[PDB]
């Protein structure tokens, strides 16, 4: 058979590839003006009989999201007031204003020497800090400083710029496409039998949290557990719920915001008086939608692990507060909530609310890096936020006694997991339209 | 019957051009991550019988290298500490701790009050400074200031960044190529009888030095003397050796390094006490190798200069230390070594060593501008430098009587010469693939 | 029989478009050949106020302005309590209270030392901090830092040319009677615009394009009161401005390589800065403007040129830059007349500011260092900006006064001749084949 080589251009063939993606929007820290608005025109191929294999963990689309958002934070906070002029000693006392026992010693009235509009004169303010914002010196009772003045300068003001996790869509460049999985039980453990394509992904809200994943994409049918290696206790387990759990969080204190000028057009905002009494910040998870919901996580664990196995949910391991508590952003203010009332029960194979206490920090290390620090501004009045628990980040402990008592704890200080939990449906491929084939000519 | 104009596309034709070259590699100041790894394959196209004319001193490839090295320094020096808060009165005398005679007056023990993490606290800090870095204040007897506080701020700590001369490759953009000279005897001007082309040059180590060129390309066969105008005085004579001369430099003092904070994450490093007796820093140049090497240079000078001419080598002319001494970086430290024992002879018509004393300097301007300054952090312990003398930068004494006995002395005040010496082999050429020739059709 | 689709490539068709333009100067070098291409018989409808070249010029000039101030000394260390009295140097009656002799404590290269520095300031740059009227501060120390260094960098209006990017062209209108009242019947294609001098002004248009046949009036809506009227003259009016004070420029360091410049003692008697406008020329100029206003406003009536109404000094008086210092000159002698339907100079007194706020924004401040010796300016008034009063008794006797200090209105008078079009070379048409 004297057959002849030929070339076809426009052949629908994919290669795995790594490229950059466009930011597509739908001031603000995330959806900045340097992001492309797009038409409400999602497109797909009406899923055909294409089988593809892809996974999580090794998906570089996650790494691009992580690095790209750091680059927004590092620019959004540059044109703000440096708080270096406030790294002074403080004379602090207890606040004494109808404080509940649980908040005793939680607030400190501190009195400091601040610079002002003129360089040769100074003034004396009287602001309230949370105990977690301040570190003592000399084992004194009256000699305090801000917690991060002995590391990179604390920089933060810009109360006009929102931290709200407004969704961002990712779009591929021409010549590239994003594959989208439509399986209901998709995991990274092999191929996705039913796939389609998009040019742009759905929007992802860059919600910051460490133990409970908030305001994400809910599983369509069943609770699903995903991990890189379930056997290896060094890996995190990402659990996606198929039913949301409503969590109501608040800081029930009618705080007054005061403002002084530090320097040449450099404003500083500082909690300056508290109307009413002092109460502890807290979050409410209904027992009714938590005690049974957790049992679905357990039902799935029983398929990955042996059945007729006793498991336990324990509280977190401790260490840095940021990796021990449920860290999240509520209205621009940072919360560090205890999870001990959510992960205490044990399970065997054979309405009321859960109230958990919260503490608040203003001075935080926003990321795992320690070369930056920020003082979140105070918020006028009382803040309340309602959010959906979409999933959990769990750590399984190690060791083995009679192959039983598997203990799980909330944990994990890495935020890559917060995007792995939503970008699991997408892969980036390159199209190579030039194909070679045998024919007759 | 006549000839027609026809067009040929893909014609091997060259034109002179100047373009932007890519930085390619294989953190640092120079070998930064924002530089593209080269293709490991030495894809030369080999030699063909082409005789291209090219030269040195009119070559813009070197000028582009010069600009990039300076810009990279500014990028690395900018995002670091400022030492402005240290422009204070220093109270010091020549306090010694078994300092030898050769070092009398080289070190001063200065007490001053540095600022600290908090505005309301002060340091009492002792710092041992090299004499070249401080000056009398008001010409008093015991009042000193850092030498550069009356010019712009001195800006540097950040000891984590390396100043090691990791080689940089230059690569042309598509449509361009670099013509490489394989003539072992090639001068800095005229045709190169043997030309091969490359897409990327070999790596060139951005070693910054003055009168003795260190760690560069060695001549393949013979000592080669290259100059823009060999009979002038306004041009430098750049001499490439065909044998390395081994040089070993050291600061035999076990220095302790201490640090304080100046401000909010603003670290400063300084020399503390020194363990052991204090000895002068020095360089050891093998005597036999140096004497044979210089004799080779003299014989080659006689091929450009006249016959039966006594050639003599004098020391440098003086003026700024930066253009009088052998100045080089080693481990991040800056040496300024004398060359008096290298250039002290007359050449007739027909395990010994040379010891060169050194005076170490901490605050430098580094280039040929005085609008900035940087402080080199000290290095803990004893430092030992091993390097190859590859070439010399010489200057001729202008003025003579009856054309006899020309005198040469070290030059090399400019930095461009350090790179001219290694880019003599390359030209940038634009390829013009579209050509026209007559034919029949 | 029937017609068959033919594709043509290289078809000369234009579409309205917005793109970036290349900024060229004497930015990239300007091509010495304008490459004007044959005036052609097309009619092109375009206008001002709906144009994009003006907005782009505004953004470009701001960026360039800031780039020249970024690498300069901040004066923040000098925002200290000042103490002062009046200057006593045969001060004329018109300069009483205009200068103050103030002392302050300046920093030095070394943290440890101070300088006792005396300098003179113009009154408009100083604010009373109360606590006894002998404790005043610089006017912008309660906003962002005031920047000053780089006396070597000029404020001169070096011409800028706008050049089309590939795929685009700039159309140029050569209609000598051109206005926004309809299309331009005389259009040429150019590669680059002529150079436009970026002269800063809030009232009179200095050193711009001149009308060639007659005085003409352009406005977005000439019958509204909410829009400004840009009047272009065809006969430049000479204006001569001066500050007849033999000054001293001194320099001190306030930090490590940080120089600060200030006004030292003034030699000679202190006199007020002023501008001279030829009276007869100004009278003829206004008469022509009036003849043109009567074509848009009811004719056979009386109209008036009135004083500005008030606001910040920047927009109430005539602000301009000359020499390297800023002037805020009163124009009361230029706009004080009515017109009836039937060697001798005008002296305009001036005020001076050293600390300047910019183009209707308050996020910065800059200090202009003083010039040594006596400064004199000569310039061409090529246009005038008018604002129409918001109604009148019996809807008659129209009155106009100075206003329109926004920077965009100055470039609208230079970029009115140009439009940016995208080239769409691909077109379809029908042929037999």
């Amino acid at each position, epitope marked *: 058979e004297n057959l002849w080589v030929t070339v076809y251009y426009g052949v629908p063939v994919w290669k795995d590839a790594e490229t950059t993606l466009f930011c597509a929007s739908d001031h603000n820290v995330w959806a900045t003006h340097a992001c492309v608005p797009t038409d409400p025109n999602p497109q797909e191929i009406h899923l055909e009989n294409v089988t593809e294999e892809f996974n999580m963990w090794k998906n570089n689309m996650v790494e691009q999201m992580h690095e790209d958002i750091i680059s927004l934070w590092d620019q959004s906070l540059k044109p703000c007031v440096k708080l270096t*002029p406030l790294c002074v000693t403080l004379q602090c006392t207890n606040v004494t204003n109808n404080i509940t026992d649980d908040m005793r010693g939680e607030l400190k009235n501190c009195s400091f*020497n601040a*610079t002002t509009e003129l*360089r*040769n*004169k*100074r003034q*004396k303010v*009287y602001s309230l800090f949370y105990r977690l914002d301040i570190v003592p010196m000399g084992e004194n009772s009256a000699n305090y400083r801000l917690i991060d003045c002995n590391t990179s300068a604390i920089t933060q003001a810009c109360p006009k710029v929102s931290f709200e996790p407004i969704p961002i869509h990712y779009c591929a460049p021409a010549g590239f496409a994003i594959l989208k999985c439509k399986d209901k039980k998709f995991n990274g453990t092999g191929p996705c039998p039913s796939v389609s394509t998009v040019q742009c992904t759905h929007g992802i809200k860059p919600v910051v949290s460490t133990q409970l994943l908030l305001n994400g994409s809910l599983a369509e049918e069943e609770v699903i557990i995903r991990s890189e290696n379930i056997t290896n206790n060094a890996k995190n387990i990402l659990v996606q719920l198929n039913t949301p759990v409503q969590i109501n969080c608040t800081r029930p204190n009618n705080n007054t915001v005061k403002s002084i000028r530090i*320097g040449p057009g450099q404003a500083f905002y500082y909690t300056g008086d508290i109307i009413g009494d002092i109460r502890q910040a807290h979050c409410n998870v209904s027992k009714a939608t938590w005690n049974e919901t957790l049992g679905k996580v357990v039902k799935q664990l029983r398929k990955h692990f042996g059945n007729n196995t006793i498991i336990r949910f324990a509280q977190s391991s401790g260490g840095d507060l940021e990796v021990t508590t449920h860290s999240f952003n509520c209205g621009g203010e940072f919360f560090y909530c205890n999870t001990s009332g959510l992960f205490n029960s044990t399970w065997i194979s054979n309405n009321d609310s859960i109230t958990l206490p919260c503490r608040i920090k203003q001075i935080i290390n926003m990321w795992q890096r320690i070369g930056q620090a920020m003082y979140a501004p105070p918020i006028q009045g009382v803040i309340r936020c309602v959010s959906n628990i979409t999933g959990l980040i769990l750590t399984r402990d190690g060791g083995s006694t009679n192959s039983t008592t598997e203990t799980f704890r909330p944990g994990g200080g890495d935020m890559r997991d917060n995007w792995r939990s939503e970008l699991y449906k997408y892969k980036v491929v390159k199209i190579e339209p030039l194909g070679v084939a045998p024919t007759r000519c | 019957e006549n000839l027609w104009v026809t067009v040929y596309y893909g014609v091997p034709v060259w034109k002179d051009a100047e373009t932007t070259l890519f930085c390619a590699s294989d953190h640092n100041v120079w070998a930064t991550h924002a530089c593209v790894p080269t293709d490991p394959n030495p894809q030369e196209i080999h030699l063909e019988n082409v005789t291209e004319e090219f030269n040195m001193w009119k070559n813009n490839m070197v000028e582009q290298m010069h600009e990039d090295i300076i810009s990279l320094w500014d990028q690395s020096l900018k995002p670091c500490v400022k030492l402005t*808060p240290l422009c204070v009165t220093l109270q010091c005398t020549n306090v010694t701790n078994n300092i030898t005679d050769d070092m009398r007056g080289e070190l001063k023990n200065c007490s001053f*009050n540095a*600022t600290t993490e908090l*505005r*309301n606290k*002060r340091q009492k800090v002792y710092s041992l400074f090299y004499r070249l870095d401080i000056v009398p204040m008001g010409e008093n007897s015991a009042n000193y200031r850092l030498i550069d506080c009356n010019t712009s701020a001195i800006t540097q700590a950040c000891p984590k960044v390396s100043f090691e001369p990791i080689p940089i490759h230059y690569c042309a953009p598509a449509g361009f190529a670099i013509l490489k000279c394989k003539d072992k005897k090639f001068n800095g001007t005229g045709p190169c009888p043997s030309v091969s082309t490359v897409q990327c040059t070999h790596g060139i180590k951005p070693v910054v030095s003055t009168q003795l060129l260190l760690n560069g390309s060695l001549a393949e066969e013979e000592v080669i003397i290259r100059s823009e105008n060999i009979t002038n005085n306004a041009k430098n004579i750049l001499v490439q050796l065909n044998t390395p001369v081994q040089i070993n430099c050291t600061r035999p003092n076990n220095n302790t390094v201490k640090s304080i904070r100046i401000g909010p994450g603003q670290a400063f490093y300084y020399t503390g006490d020194i363990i052991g007796d204090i000895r002068q820093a020095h360089c050891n140049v093998s005597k036999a190798t140096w004497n044979e090497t210089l004799g080779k240079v003299v014989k080659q000078l006689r091929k450009h200069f006249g016959n039966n001419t006594i050639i003599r080598f004098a020391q440098s002319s003086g003026g700024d230390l930066e253009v009088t001494t052998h100045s080089f970086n080693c481990g991040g430290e800056f040496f300024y070594c004398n060359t008096s024992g290298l250039f002290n002879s007359t050449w007739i018509s027909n395990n010994d060593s040379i010891t060169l004393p050194c005076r170490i300097k901490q605050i430098i301007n580094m280039w040929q501008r005085i609008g900035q300054a940087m402080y080199a952090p000290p290095i803990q312990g004893v430092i030992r430098c091993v390097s190859n003398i590859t070439g010399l930068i010489l200057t001729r004494d202008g003025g003579s009587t009856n054309s006899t006995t020309e005198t040469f002395r070290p030059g090399g005040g400019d930095m461009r010469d350090n790179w001219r010496s290694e880019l003599y082999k390359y030209k940038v050429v634009k390829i013009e693939p579209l050509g026209v020739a007559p034919t029949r059709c | 029989e029937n017609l068959w689709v033919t594709v043509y490539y290289g078809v000369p068709v234009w579409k309205d478009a917005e793109t970036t333009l290349f900024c060229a100067s004497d930015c990239v070098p300007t091509d010495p050949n304008p490459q004007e291409i044959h005036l052609e018989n097309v009619t092109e409808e375009f206008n001002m106020w709906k144009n994009n070249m003006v907005e782009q010029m505004h953004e470009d000039i701001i960026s360039l302005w800031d780039q020249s101030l970024k690498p300069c000394v901040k004066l*923040t*260390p000098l925002c200290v*309590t000042l103490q002062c009295t009046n200057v006593t140097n045969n001060i004329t009656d018109d300069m009483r209270g205009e200068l103050k002799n103030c002392s302050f*404590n300046a*920093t030095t290269e070394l*943290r*440890n030392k*101070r300088q006792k520095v005396y300098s003179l300031f113009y009154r408009l740059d100083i604010v009373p901090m109360g*606590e*006894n009227s002998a404790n005043y501060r610089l006017i912008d120390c309660n906003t962002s830092a005031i920047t000053q260094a780089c006396p070597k960098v000029s404020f001169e209006p070096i011409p800028i040319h706008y050049c089309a990017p590939a795929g685009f062209a700039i159309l140029k209108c050569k209609d000598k009677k051109f206005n926004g009242t309809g299309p331009c019947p005389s259009v040429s294609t150019v590669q680059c615009t002529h150079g436009i001098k970026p002269v800063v002004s809030t009232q009179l248009l200095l050193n711009g394009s001149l009308a060639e046949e007659e005085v003409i009036i352009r406005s977005e809506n000439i019958t509204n009161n909410a829009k400004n009227i840009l009047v272009q003259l065809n006969t430049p009016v000479q204006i001569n401005c001066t500050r007849p004070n033999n000054n001293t420029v001194k320099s001190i360091r306030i930090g490590p390589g940080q120089a600060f410049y200030y006004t030292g003692d003034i030699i000679g008697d202190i006199r007020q800065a002023h501008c001279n406008v030829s009276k007869a020329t100004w009278n003829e100029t206004l008469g022509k403007v009036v003849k043109q206003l009567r074509k848009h406003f009811g004719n056979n009536t009386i109209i008036r040129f009135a004083q500005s109404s008030g606001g910040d000094l920047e927009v109430t008086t005539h602000s301009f830059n000359c020499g390297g210092e800023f002037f805020y000159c009163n124009t009361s002698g230029l706009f004080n007349s009515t017109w009836i339907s039937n060697n001798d100079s005008i002296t305009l007194p001036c005020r001076i500011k050293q600390i300047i706020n910019m183009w209707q924004r308050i996020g910065q401040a800059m200090y202009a260092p003083p010039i040594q010796g006596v400064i004199r300016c000569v310039s061409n008034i090529t246009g005038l900006i008018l604002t129409r009063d918001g109604g009148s008794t019996n809807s008659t006797t129209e009155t106009f006064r100075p206003g329109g200090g926004d920077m965009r209105d100055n470039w609208r008078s230079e970029l009115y001749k140009y439009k940016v079009v995208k080239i769409e070379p691909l077109g379809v048409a029908p042929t037999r084949c």
Partner: antibody
Framework: EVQLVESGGGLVKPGGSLRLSCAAS????????MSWVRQAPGKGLEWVGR??????????DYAAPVKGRFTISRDDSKNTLYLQMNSLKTEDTAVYYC?????????????????????????WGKGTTVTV | EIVLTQSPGTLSLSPGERATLSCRAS???????LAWYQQKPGQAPRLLIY???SRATGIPDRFSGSGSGTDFTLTISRLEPEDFAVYYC????????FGPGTKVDI
């Protein structure tokens, strides 16, 4: 002008009341805590009482002979003080002075704060009398 | 209320002599709360020294003080005619209880 305004003059009877007042601009309440001192002819100085400025609270301390019905107050608008007197006693036959002081700082830098001049000036009135 | 009893009460020295003044109290207050004033006859008093050793502005260098528990002192190294005044010791222990006053005569 570092001079307190004097007031509180006039004729009263012991079987009545008297209100004294004082103070001035410059040495304003935002920078000062103020007090009253009295002196009978032939006697030394006696402290009457002191009132703190707005910021730190304003709690007023008094000397025993003037407690309860001879109080001190702070205006907070025109920077003036008042001293209320009632049912005058023979020990009240004294000159009543208005007095306070300002600690003034003038820093040479907006960075370190140990390179600063310092001034501590007290200002006194001339004193009024109580016609017991 | 700290009780002060100025020991000299009646000091008499020619101009040019050292007027050593002394005051004493049984109550213990830190030396920070020691203050001396100078009262010219017919005039309101003025503060010389506060905080035992710290000096008020407008005061000659000849004026210096010290003190601790009960024994507090003021030194005027050389009297000038302008210094013949009654001096007062003040113990600012939350109450400015003054001593009786020490007259310095010729």
């Amino acid at each position: 002008e570092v001079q307190l305004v004097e007031s509180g003059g006039g004729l009263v009877k012991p079987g009545g009341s008297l209100r004294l007042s004082c103070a001035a601009s410059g040495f304003t309440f935002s920078n000062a805590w103020m007090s009253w001192v009295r002196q009978a002819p032939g006697k030394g100085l006696e402290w009457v009482g002191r009132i703190k400025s707005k910021t730190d609270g304003g709690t007023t301390d008094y000397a025993a002979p003037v407690k309860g019905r001879f109080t001190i107050s702070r205006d907070d608008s025109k920077n003036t003080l008042y001293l209320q007197m009632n049912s005058l006693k023979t020990e009240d036959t004294a000159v009543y002075y208005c007095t306070t002081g300002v600690e003034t700082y003038d820093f040479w830098s907006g960075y370190d704060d140990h390179y600063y001049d310092y001034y501590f000036r007290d200002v006194w009135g001339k004193g009024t009398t109580v016609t017991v | 209320e700290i009780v002060l009893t100025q020991s000299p009460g009646t000091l008499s020295l020619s101009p040019g002599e050292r007027a050593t003044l002394s005051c004493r109290a049984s109550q213990s207050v830190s030396s920070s709360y020691l203050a001396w004033y100078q009262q010219k006859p017919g005039q309101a008093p003025r503060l010389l020294i506060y905080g035992a050793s710290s000096r008020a502005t407008g005061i000659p260098d000849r004026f210096s003080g010290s003190g601790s528990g009960t024994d507090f002192t003021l030194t005027i190294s050389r009297l000038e005619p302008e210094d013949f005044a009654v001096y007062y010791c003040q113990q600012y222990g939350s109450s400015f209880t003054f001593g009786p006053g020490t007259k310095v005569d010729i």
